[PDB]
Structure 1
């Protein structure tokens, strides 16, 4: 399971942003700089999907996976106490640095992300929310940590799942295979300097794109074109394993 944190051990500081049904803050854990993921007032099935994320992340240990200190229950709020990463989300940094991010830097990120996902695949564990926003920069060569997936994908509404297109695996709209799709969509996002395909488009348009099984663009980066195309296949069984992806990233 996960460690229980008393509210006396933590101090809530600046607001960093928002997640699905959460508010993200900087904080202190009694001293360590932490990140506090404050769950909105929620029903037991939502809080349970949040505890399951805490449980999963507490039972894993990988260099490219962010640490989870535990969970604090503060009135109607569930707080996941997590590792603070220096430079924050990758997507934000790619947009600020657009047109000035070298291809070699992007390959380092891809390799490190595939390493974290290969580790989870071998343990038959699913992340379910691979995207640039969940990729944290510990070092700007770069060093990443994949964040916890927040509230589990299984507990969200159709509307929330449509909002996650193109990162959301198509089989999830109506298995470790979903993370191959998430990984492929993240590679496109990285290649396009944080500008993911379909992100501006309406929910109806995003859903229609998946319903007709239209395919996402080929990345402008040629070394990742075959990889993304193989990952972004509608047939989950047709997606390469992370062992294969990781092996193909060394060459």
Structure 2
């Protein structure tokens, strides 16, 4: 059950973007924190569109299922806004935002060791989810947020967290799922009820391709009909020019779901590139 946050204690500021049927804002939460000290806390606010109240249950279930587990690489959910008739999730504000846009912005200052560390963190999170038999269902670089940049002064790697999947592919319109090829796997285009832990191993491979491609979007040049043809003809993504993770990517994007490797195996591969 979500903690209730008063709207009096939440200020909505700038729009950061949109998700599927949602708008996203930075804001400030006034809260009593540790030792009773009043704090002004940055928050990430996710507002379900008023025209899409039909999806409210899935919208909230997405955050609720992640919030029932605790992990260093999973975004913290703060609760929900007691916000009139609106449907609003309140979550941790991650300083440097989405990995996909960060990759693009800093394609100069990002080398393969940086990409490898982020891939290892993502695999660590998915391993945790796998052990908990918890399906995410929307792993993508947009949904990976950068807490802290590489700090050469201190040697510390970048650190990331994974945000919740949003409204599930099991209820979204077919055309949205097709637009999400190649993150949505072939068997889920066949039938979205095929959502499985193996879904996430496929989507991990797509996200790794995004990590290795400087924030390019795979298959962006293909319209939905052509994206379906990509799966019909059983193609694979092209090797990223930074090709060190090409094999791992194709191994995860296996058209047979049962053959996709465990995240234990995936972490082993990542750690053996050394």
Of 120, 125, 129 in structure 2, the residue corresponding to residue 120 of structure 1 is 129
The aligned residue for residue 241 of structure 2 is 220
Following superposition, the deviation at residue 219 of structure 1 comes to: 2.9
Secondary structure at 1:153 match in 2 = coil
Deviation, structure 1 residue 159: 1.1
**Residue 191 (str. 1) matches residue 212 (str. 2):** yes
Tell me, yes or no, if structure 1 residue 146 matches structure 2 residue 162. yes
SS at structure 2 position matched to 1:160? helix
Give the TM-score, by structure 2 length.
0.87
Displaced runs of 4+ in structure 1, greater than 6 A?
Answer: none
**C-alpha distance in 2, partners of 1:115/1:145?**
11
Is the Cα contact below 8 Å between 1:2 and 1:54 reproduced in 2?
A: no
Contact (CA 8 Å) 2:212, 2:243: kept in 1 or not? no
Paired position in structure 1 for 2:22: 22
1:162 matched to which residue of 2? Answer: 178
Partner in structure 2 of residue 232 of structure 1: 253
Q: What is the total number of aligned residue pairs between the two structures?
A: 251
Q: Specify the structure having the higher radius of gyration (Cα).
A: 2
The question of 1:206 aligning with 2:227 is answered: yes
User: Gaps (5+ residues) in structure 2?
Assistant: 31-39, 150-156, 191-195
* Structure-1 residue corresponding to 2:34: none
For residues 1-251 of structure 1, the aligned pairs below 5 Å read 1-30=1-30, 31-42=40-51, 45-140=54-149, 141-174=157-190, 175-251=196-272
TM-score, length-normalised on structure 1? 0.95
RMSD after superposition: 1.5
Partners of 2:140 and 2:206 within 8 A in 1: yes
Asked if the contact 1:192–1:219 (Cα under 8 Å) also holds between the matched residues in 2, the reply is yes
- Does the 8 A contact of 1:17 with 1:24 survive in 2? yes
Distance between the aligned counterparts of 1:186 and 1:225, measured in 2?
12
Q: Which runs of 5+ in 1 are unaligned?
A: none
